[PDB]
Amino acid sequence: PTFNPELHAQTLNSERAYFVQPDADPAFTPHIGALVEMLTYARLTTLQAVEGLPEDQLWATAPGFANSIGTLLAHIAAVERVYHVLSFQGRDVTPEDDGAAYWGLTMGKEGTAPARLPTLDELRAELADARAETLRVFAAKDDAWLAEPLGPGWANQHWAWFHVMEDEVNHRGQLRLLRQVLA
């Protein structure tokens, strides 16, 4: 099996979003399944935080908030893209080889900037596309894989994917405050 969205939370407006069910979906082994639930919840809460945002506020900053909502959304997707390289391809990321991801990763300070800045819809599409790739690969792996060190070292697979989730939540806390300042 592959990821079936109907077996996971699709909205925060349901009791499903408040259950972590590691065996919900036969596409995933148990620890991987638990990660999928957590990643799903983190993404639903990121999207709720920016839902309805006036588009003229997307790149706005404020005192104490050096990174705009758009910058943070680019960053969240880019961290996932970076971990596809570290976790799935097994190599370190560089600005040479991974320029777009590196730009997102570094809040636009390094790497390769896009030709024009993305719209909010494009940012959400890139978030979804990154996540689709994660879930594709997760369906191919098992919990023994999750215990392995990363190819480039210094962490294990379980931590790496936890970190993708945790960093999203970290920046979503920031997004909540910035939106409130701007709006």
Added chain:
Amino acid sequence: PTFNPELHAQTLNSERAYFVQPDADPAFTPHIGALVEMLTYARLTTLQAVEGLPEDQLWATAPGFANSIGTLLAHIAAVERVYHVLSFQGRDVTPEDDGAAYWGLTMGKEGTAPARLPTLDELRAELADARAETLRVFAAKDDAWLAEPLGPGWANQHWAWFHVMEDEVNHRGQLRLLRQVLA
């Protein structure tokens, strides 16, 4: 067995902090073990965020930041205390029965305020004390328990403890920005 701190990350300055090892500690069943690792990592990162903070900044606010660092640290501990009630005792929390926790939970707006505000050391002691109680109880439970609905309903045990971790990380993102504004 009960929680042995030597079997878990004790510092962010070690490769141990970047491994999630659900079977590290015989005190815990696998999904519970994974939560413990995640909760541990979240707490280490909260403490790093406030380490060395000048104490005169503890209750300071700034434009866009209605909740001070002290308020957020009180909140993080209080959410854990609230979940001890919901998860372990099996009842809803009220301002009548859980006044101190309710004050932390609500950023000081409801509930029962302390006689005087805590110092940074006291805030960290309360964080540690709350966590000790969590780990005590986790050693008594198994993964079947983690799948159960909460007694007061609306979530499962697995989600509840995930949420304690995730909300900490959310507010730690806020703490990072506030400290940078003040300092």
